[PDB]
Amino acid sequence: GVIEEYLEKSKTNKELNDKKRLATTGANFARAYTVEFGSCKFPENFTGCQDLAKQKKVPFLSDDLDLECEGKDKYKCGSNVFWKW
Amino acid sequence: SDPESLRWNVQAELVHSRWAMLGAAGIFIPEFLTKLGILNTPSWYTAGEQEYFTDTTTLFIVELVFIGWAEGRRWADILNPGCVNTDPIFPNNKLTGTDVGYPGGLWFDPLGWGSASPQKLKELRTKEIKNGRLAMLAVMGAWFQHIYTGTGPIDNLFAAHLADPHATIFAAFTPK
Amino acid sequence: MRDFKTYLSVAPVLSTLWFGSLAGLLIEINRFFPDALTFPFF
Amino acid sequence: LVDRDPIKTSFEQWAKPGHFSRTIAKGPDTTTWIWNLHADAHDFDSHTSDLEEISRKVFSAHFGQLSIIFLWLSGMYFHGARFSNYEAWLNDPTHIGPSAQVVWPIVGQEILNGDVGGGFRGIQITSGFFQIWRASGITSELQLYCTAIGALVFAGLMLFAGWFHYHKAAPKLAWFQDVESMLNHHLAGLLGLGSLSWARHQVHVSLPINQFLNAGVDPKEIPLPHEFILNRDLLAQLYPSFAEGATPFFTLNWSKYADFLTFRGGLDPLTGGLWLTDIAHHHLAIAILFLIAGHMYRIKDILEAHKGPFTGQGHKGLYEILTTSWHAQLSINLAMLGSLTIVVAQHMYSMPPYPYLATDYATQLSLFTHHMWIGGFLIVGAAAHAAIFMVRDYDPTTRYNDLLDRVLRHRDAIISHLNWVCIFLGFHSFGLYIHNDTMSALGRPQDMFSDTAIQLQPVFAQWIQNTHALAPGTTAPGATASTSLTWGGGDLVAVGNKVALLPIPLGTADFLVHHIHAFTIHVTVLILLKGVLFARSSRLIPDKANLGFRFPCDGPGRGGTCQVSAWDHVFLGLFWMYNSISVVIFHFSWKMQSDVWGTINDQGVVTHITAGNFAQSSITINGWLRDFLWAQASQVIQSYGSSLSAYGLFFLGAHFVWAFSLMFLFSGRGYWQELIESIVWAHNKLKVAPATQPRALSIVQGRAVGVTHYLLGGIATTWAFFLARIIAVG
Amino acid sequence: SDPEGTGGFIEPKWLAYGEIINGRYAMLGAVGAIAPEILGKAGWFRTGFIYNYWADSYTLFVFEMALMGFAEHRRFQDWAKPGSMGKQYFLGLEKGLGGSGEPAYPGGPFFNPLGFGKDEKKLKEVKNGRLAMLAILGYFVQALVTGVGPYQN
Ligand code: CLA
Ligand code: CLA
Ligand code: CLA
Ligand code: CLA
Ligand SMILES: CC(=CC=C/C(C)=C/C=C/C=C(C)\C=C\C=C(C)\C=C\C1=C(C)CCCC1(C)C)/C=C/C1=C(C)CCCC1(C)C
Ligand SMILES: CCCCCCCCCCCCO[C@H]1O[C@H](CO)[C@@H](O[C@H]2O[C@H](CO)[C@@H](O)[C@H](O)[C@H]2O)[C@H](O)[C@H]1O
Numbered sequence A: 001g002v003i004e005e006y007l008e009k010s011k012t013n014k015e016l017n018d019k020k021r022l023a024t025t026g027a028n029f030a031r032a033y034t035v036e037f038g039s040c041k042f043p044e045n046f047t048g049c050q051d052l053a054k055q056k057k058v059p060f061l062s063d064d065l066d067l068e069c070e071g072k073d074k075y076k077c078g079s080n081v082f083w084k085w
Numbered sequence B: 001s002d003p004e005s006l007r008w009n010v011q012a013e014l015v016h017s018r019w020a021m022l023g024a025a026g027i028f029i030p031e032f033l034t035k036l037g038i039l040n041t042p043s044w045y046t047a048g049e050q051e052y053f054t055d056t057t058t059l060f061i062v063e064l065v066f067i068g069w070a071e072g073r074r075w076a077d078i079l080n081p082g083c084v085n086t087d088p089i090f091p092n093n094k095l096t097g098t099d100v101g102y103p104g105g106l107w108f109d110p111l112g113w114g115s116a117s118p119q120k121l122k123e124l125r126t127k128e129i130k131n132g133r134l135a136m137l138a139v140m141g142a143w144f145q146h147i148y149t150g151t152g153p154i155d156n157l158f159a160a161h162l163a164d165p166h167a168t169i170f171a172a173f174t175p176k
Numbered sequence C: 001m002r003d004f005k006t007y008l009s010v011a012p013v014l015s016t017l018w019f020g021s022l023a024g025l026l027i028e029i030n031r032f033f034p035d036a037l038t039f040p041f042f
Numbered sequence D: 001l002v003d004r005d006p007i008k009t010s011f012e013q014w015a016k017p018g019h020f021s022r023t024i025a026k027g028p029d030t031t032t033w034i035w036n037l038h039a040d041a042h043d044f045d046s047h048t049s050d051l052e053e054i055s056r057k058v059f060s061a062h063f064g065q066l067s068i069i070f071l072w073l074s075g076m077y078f079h080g081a082r083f084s085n086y087e088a089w090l091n092d093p094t095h096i097g098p099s100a101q102v103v104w105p106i107v108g109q110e111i112l113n114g115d116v117g118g119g120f121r122g123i124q125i126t127s128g129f130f131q132i133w134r135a136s137g138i139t140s141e142l143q144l145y146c147t148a149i150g151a152l153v154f155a156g157l158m159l160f161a162g163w164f165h166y167h168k169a170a171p172k173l174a175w176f177q178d179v180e181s182m183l184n185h186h187l188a189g190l191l192g193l194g195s196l197s198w199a200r201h202q203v204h205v206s207l208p209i210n211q212f213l214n215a216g217v218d219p220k221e222i223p224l225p226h227e228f229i230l231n232r233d234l235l236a237q238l239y240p241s242f243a244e245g246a247t248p249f250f251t252l253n254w255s256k257y258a259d260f261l262t263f264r265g266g267l268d269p270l271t272g273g274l275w276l277t278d279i280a281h282h283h284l285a286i287a288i289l290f291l292i293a294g295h296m297y298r299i300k301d302i303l304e305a306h307k308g309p310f311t312g313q314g315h316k317g318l319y320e321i322l323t324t325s326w327h328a329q330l331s332i333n334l335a336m337l338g339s340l341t342i343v344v345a346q347h348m349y350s351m352p353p354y355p356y357l358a359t360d361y362a363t364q365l366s367l368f369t370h371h372m373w374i375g376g377f378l379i380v381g382a383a384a385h386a387a388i389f390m391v392r393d394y395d396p397t398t399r400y401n402d403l404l405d406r407v408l409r410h411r412d413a414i415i416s417h418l419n420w421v422c423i424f425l426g427f428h429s430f431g432l433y434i435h436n437d438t439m440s441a442l443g444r445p446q447d448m449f450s451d452t453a454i455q456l457q458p459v460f461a462q463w464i465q466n467t468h469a470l471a472p473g474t475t476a477p478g479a480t481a482s483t484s485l486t487w488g489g490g491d492l493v494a495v496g497n498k499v500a501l502l503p504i505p506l507g508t509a510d511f512l513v514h515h516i517h518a519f520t521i522h523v524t525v526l527i528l529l530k531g532v533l534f535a536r537s538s539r540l541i542p543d544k545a546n547l548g549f550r551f552p553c554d555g556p557g558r559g560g561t562c563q564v565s566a567w568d569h570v571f572l573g574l575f576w577m578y579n580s581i582s583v584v585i586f587h588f589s590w591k592m593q594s595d596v597w598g599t600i601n602d603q604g605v606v607t608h609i610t611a612g613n614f615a616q617s618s619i620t621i622n623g624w625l626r627d628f629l630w631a632q633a634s635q636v637i638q639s640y641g642s643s644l645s646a647y648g649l650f651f652l653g654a655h656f657v658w659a660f661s662l663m664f665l666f667s668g669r670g671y672w673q674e675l676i677e678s679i680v681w682a683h684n685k686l687k688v689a690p691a692t693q694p695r696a697l698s699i700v701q702g703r704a705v706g707v708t709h710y711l712l713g714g715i716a717t718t719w720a721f722f723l724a725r726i727i728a729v730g
Numbered sequence E: 001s002d003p004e005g006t007g008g009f010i011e012p013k014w015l016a017y018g019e020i021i022n023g024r025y026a027m028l029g030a031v032g033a034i035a036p037e038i039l040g041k042a043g044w045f046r047t048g049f050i051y052n053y054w055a056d057s058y059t060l061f062v063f064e065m066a067l068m069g070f071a072e073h074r075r076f077q078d079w080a081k082p083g084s085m086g087k088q089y090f091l092g093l094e095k096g097l098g099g100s101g102e103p104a105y106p107g108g109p110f111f112n113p114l115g116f117g118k119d120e121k122k123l124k125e126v127k128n129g130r131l132a133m134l135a136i137l138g139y140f141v142q143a144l145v146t147g148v149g150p151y152q153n
């Protein structure tokens, strides 16, 4: 090597850089820096509107965690009246 | 059930050790010393920026005319006089042996109490950190590895490549 | 640890670390001068 | 020996002249004991007079083979990987011409590295990986690079089981000296649980990942690294997820199926390596047996049972000492292991089991002669080690009056016959050819032995071949073609680069080689049979078990008294077998190319590597160098300046090394002594010799350096002669 | 001297008794059921998914199981014994304060003697039943018939 001025004028810099908003990652799921969403409440399926739907709803999905448990109807087998068809 | 191997010179391995490793002192503190931003800057114009190069391999010659000299004088009269022939005292010689060096010749000796005893106390000091230096430099010579491998962009060689997150090198710390 | 008037032993075929290697360093001269059949001198 | 013990050194024995028979390597210096030490290094008349250990060594020093076969394979999987050509060859078979090895361009080298396929410089292959490797229900270069270290894993570990024996304070007697179960286990679940296990990873994964390879694609445009789990959805193309069946049995309905298998026989048009739709079924249908079978049992009982009049009273009791031998239960084995290898050598060439073989000519004949020299090199052995029994193994004579004591009873007898057998053969088995010369060089064909002159008439056909390719009409179910396409009846269409297998016709020039084999296989065995039988006692020497099964020769008297022994019957028995195999090889390729190997084009007008030159012209034993040796080999002696070249360039050495054996074979012994001193003299004048008394070769060592050379000479000669006439045209 | 490792009919069983004991609370999923709301899966196929998951990610996974495995073999050496573990502090007579002793169970000793009213009305069984908790999730990872399902039902 051989140096002329000055290892730098303006020193090392933007090569790690993050600073005001060191953001990416902690953020991104800056959908969900706060996975905030819906109602507060309540009636039904929420997941509005974006997100969607409710797809199969109640205890399902939601799990997720919907919530709650309900006097149901508690999933278990048989029903859903396998409404297909 | 356990090896057959205390190399009798189990006694000598230990003294290129105090060689190797005390020695790595020279690199350990002057490096990170360096002097972050001294104020700052590393610039060496002087014998070096106009007289057609300075060193490289006149480097070595002069450079280790002395290491030359001194490293030789180092083990080859560490001690051992008597210095020839012909039956066993083991190390692979002590064919100095029972005679240190001279029967009433000169002052072969250092120090009173007919030996060489640099006195009794000083196990302290260099048992500890020093055969430390052996140990120490094992792992910040295991940093030599970490400190640079990855050939900072400027070259992938034999292209596996083989994944890709982000770079690596040195300066202290770590993302984590 | 080895001074004057012969030393320590070695195995049956350290010749296999003497055919292989030493001699091996000689291909190492037979590519530095990748060729012979007479030779310039120094 | 101390050093000193018993009990009361860990301090190991490194230093103090000798060990091995007791006025041992003596203080006094010599050389002979340096071929001693290596030879007979493994042996057992010394180490201790007490079984015990030995089995505790052989179950360890064994181990380091598996581990080795394991360090090997790895450098082959690695090799068959990053030194690629496999990736390139597979999208592009029929086309490539594979490699795994490549030089480095030091000195002359590079000529040896000549464009092999998927665009690179290298040296070819006649060792059918790239073809077991068809398997890879996955494909990928770095992947074989796991199967590779997976190899080095089994090794280090399946090599620290060898530390975890002998060196560790070992098991003992009962452990093997109760045999009671051993095969129970072995055959049941490994013989079984492999073939079984192999089934599960032979339709799961492989079948599908070449069911839709036999068409096109470029891999990873197919077979992911996991893809083949619970996803029993692609298994949908290659049969049901059982649909409505539950664990075979019958209350099942097929209005249109019958699981994978659906038995084949013949050859894929596009990959004639025999069908895989079968390959699961057959391995499944194995294992079961083994799975049921390895469930005998605990041992005498069954053998302690059926006797008769002339039969074997000692049949009953056929060896307590078959839990107390080795040298016996090794010799038996080698005859089988060995004789059960070269049965491979056929079912291979007349029924390929891998995709792309036959079309691949050179990459499965190499095979059929490599596998061929083991089903021979392991058989003469299978006699040697019986001689090693017959001489010594047991302590005393506790073994008595039985099947053997019987066979020996006659002995100037079992071998009295067998002899005449051979001279009946030989006369009917070789001078047969010589007729032709003497009378075709006299020249009157009217009366030769031609496939046409001596009465046989344009047909061979009616025997059993013609009731094999035609048998899918018996109790036989069926499945288009046969079992092995090389059989008389029907079919043709086999392959679209070159050819594969077709009928393979016979008569004479197939009749009489087939017979030279007889006489060759027979006089081989005469010498081994009589050799191992007369192991210990005879009416040339009865005081003749008194050292070991070697011993040079008893002594100038009795007339000759030289060869005798049985090291040496297993020395002149190799000498033949080198022929036995060396002429069987000579047979196959001259057939398999004279006919079979050749090639299709329009109207599939077949064009063998040689329009059947065999015809009237192997029958002459000169035609065997007119049509063979001088014809083919023109490729070995043209091979200079090329890529394979290393063959022609071997073919001189090793065609030299053989012609160096005779020196070791044909010579005296106090000769090279008488000579070695003239030497030793000139030595002493300068002061340069005595220490370690330089000595000539140990009569029978001399024979050891015959034979072994005569073989690695006389053999690789063709290993070269071959690879040089299937690479390049053929 | 060289470290030791005595095999003898059945060490392999004392440490093999132990291996499963640790794995019986490394059973985890139903022993501490609050542990996984969905954490048994490391991270469906459909599966569940109406990754695997949000997550608790990362790297620094080897360093743990190694470094705290660099402790498993210390309560295996230290208490070979000659005791001095409580190096205390050079000066200061005020350090009667103890803590326990060697602990197995409610601590130093058992303690606070005084007890029984109500709670009311060996020890390989405290083992045996939790492989009957271990090997149970074992097949429950692959616990599916899928194409079909519960024949039973
Ligand atoms: C690191 C270890 C080690 C050490 C220090 C020893 C030391 C000893 N072993 Mg030993 N052994 C070891 C590992 C070791 N073993 C392993 C791993 C195995 C099983 C694989 C064995 C199986 C074994 C047996 C059966 C016996 C011993 C015996 C002995 C004693 C005699 C050794 C000798 O001079 O053999 C010299 C031989 C070697 C140094 C090489 C070993 C051969 C194998 C493992 C590798 C070489 C194959 C290689 C591919 C060469 C062929 C290719 C060639 C062209 C290069 C000695 C105390 C013997 C005893 O108890 O006294 C009678 C007894 O016979 N060992
Ligand atoms: C399953 C079997 C196998 C096993 C485990 C054994 C085991 C044994 N055999 Mg044996 N044998 C076998 C198969 C086997 N054999 C076969 C198939 C044959 C027929 C050829 C023989 C013929 C035979 C004879 C005649 C003898 C034995 C003997 C022995 C014992 C001595 C072993 C020894 O010291 O190494 C010996 C090995 C060497 C000294 C190494 C030299 C190998 C040379 C010749 C190299 C081979 C050529 C090759 C191409 C060169 C390498 C490449 C090079 C060009 C770079 C031992 C118990 C001997 C005995 O006295 O019994 C107690 C007796 O000598 N065997
Ligand atoms: C293996 C080989 C062998 C055989 C089988 C033959 C066979 C033959 N050679 Mg021939 N030949 C041979 C080697 C052989 N040769 C060799 C090596 C040479 C060069 C040395 C010749 C040179 C040669 C010439 C020049 C000629 C022949 C000819 C012949 C033919 C006339 C034979 C004859 O008239 O004998 C007379 C036959 C008998 C007396 C028959 C009895 C012998 C048999 C029956 C013995 C059977 C044993 C018995 C059945 C055992 C059963 C026990 C009993 C109680 C039932 C005949 C086909 C001639 C020819 O022109 O052929 C076309 C011609 O002369 N050969
Ligand atoms: C020492 C003796 C003298 C010499 C120089 C020869 C030389 C030869 N004899 Mg010969 N012979 C002799 C005396 C001699 N003989 C005597 C007294 C008799 C008895 C009367 C015979 C009977 C005899 C017969 C019957 C035969 C020969 C044959 C041969 C030739 C083999 C071809 C060859 O080597 O190509 C030369 C080219 C090379 C050697 C290239 C070598 C390159 C390779 C091997 C690699 C490099 C070497 C490397 C170290 C090998 C790898 C090994 C590695 C694992 C270390 C060779 C020219 C044979 C022949 O070919 O036709 C007659 C035939 O078999 N001889
Ligand atoms: C002259 C020579 C050589 C030759 C050689 C020859 C002239 C020959 C040889 C040969 C060898 C061989 C040959 C070996 C081997 C091998 C192998 C490896 C084999 C293999 C195989 C198998 C696998 C089995 C069978 C078949 C075969 C064979 C293929 C040399 C010489 C020299 C000199 C001058 C001096 C110094 C040294 C030297 C340098 C050395
Ligand atoms: C080699 C010495 C001849 C002695 C045996 C001859 C007897 C049998 C006749 C030829 C045997 C070869 O069999 C060969 O027949 C035909 C050659 O004309 C070829 O005929 C093929 O080509 C055409 C393309 O559709 C069609 O006429 C046929 O449907 C098809 O099978 C076949 O590739 C093969 O079946």
Ligand SMILES: CC1=C(C/C=C(\C)CCC[C@H](C)CCC[C@@H](C)CCCC(C)C)C(=O)c2ccccc2C1=O
Pocket (backbone or CB within 6 Å): C015, D663, D664, D665, D666, D667, D668, D669, D672, D695, D696, D697, D698, D699, D701, D702, D703
């Ligand atoms: C030629 C021949 C000899 C003479 C063969 C000899 C002496 C071969 C032995 C030569 C050895 C192998 C040379 C070993 C020297 C080197 C190993 C030492 C130097 C080490 C290397 C670095 C070179 C016999 O002794 C003999 C005995 C019985 C029947 C037939 C014959 C026979 O035909």
